[PDB]
Symmetry: C2
Subunit: 130 residues, 2 copies
């Protein structure tokens, strides 16, 4: 088989479990909220790398989060293209409730590996990346 | 870091290279065409697992491939819901031209691992799957 083919299978199974347990928060949405909480006021262009997204995908997703009162943003006075992102009080509640759920979904797959197998799996993924 | 987080990073980098080299054929589209060529006349419901897709995603994608003369389908006379999928002559040409391109994109990431690291990476992904 192809290694990237079975990776799609493992990823699809992970997405299927994640969607069932967290119907209103996908993994890219969850990663965006986690990165904002790790660095309140993070610049939106830096949030692209921190949450593994794109400029267009993040701008769309942040606009929906903003419209639902979960995300607050400010602008650079010298360049309104630059924006800084914060979690609202409701956003902190949504993220705090999702963290134990998301951790349990990861544990369903990672828990099948030993501690040495988990630490090494992280080494191989990092070795393949650019 | 989270193992499934870095997996998104590695997957996003792989998709970015794949989109640049194969602008008109994504990896799910490529996997569907590969599975049809491996089993000509495969039932559409079996193509879901063989290509790592869903019933709705595959039906949408096969309809577009059919409209572009790349995919040919027949129906069960006792149940028109069941369909069997073939590659057309143009579909075989599109897939044959994409295989060396897609293999080189995989090699960009897998080639950074030794043969033992590649064989073992496949073991860990299989161990995590349901």
């Amino acid at each position: 088989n192809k290694a990237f083919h079975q990776l799609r299978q493992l990823f699809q199974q992970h997405t299927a479990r994640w969607q069932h347990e967290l119907p209103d928060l996908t993994k890219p949405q969850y990663a965006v909220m986690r990165a904002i909480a790790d660095k309140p006021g993070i610049e939106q262009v830096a949030l692209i790398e921190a949450a593994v997204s794109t400029k267009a995908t993040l701008a769309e997703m942040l606009a929906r989060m903003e419209n639902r009162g979960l995300v607050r943003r400010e602008h650079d006075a010298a360049d309104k293209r630059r924006r800084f992102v914060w979690l609202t009080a409701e956003g902190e509640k949504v993220l705090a409730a999702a963290i134990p759920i998301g951790d349990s979904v990861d544990e369903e797959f990672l828990g099948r590996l030993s501690a040495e197998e988990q630490e090494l799996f992280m080494q191989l993924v990092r070795k393949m990346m650019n």
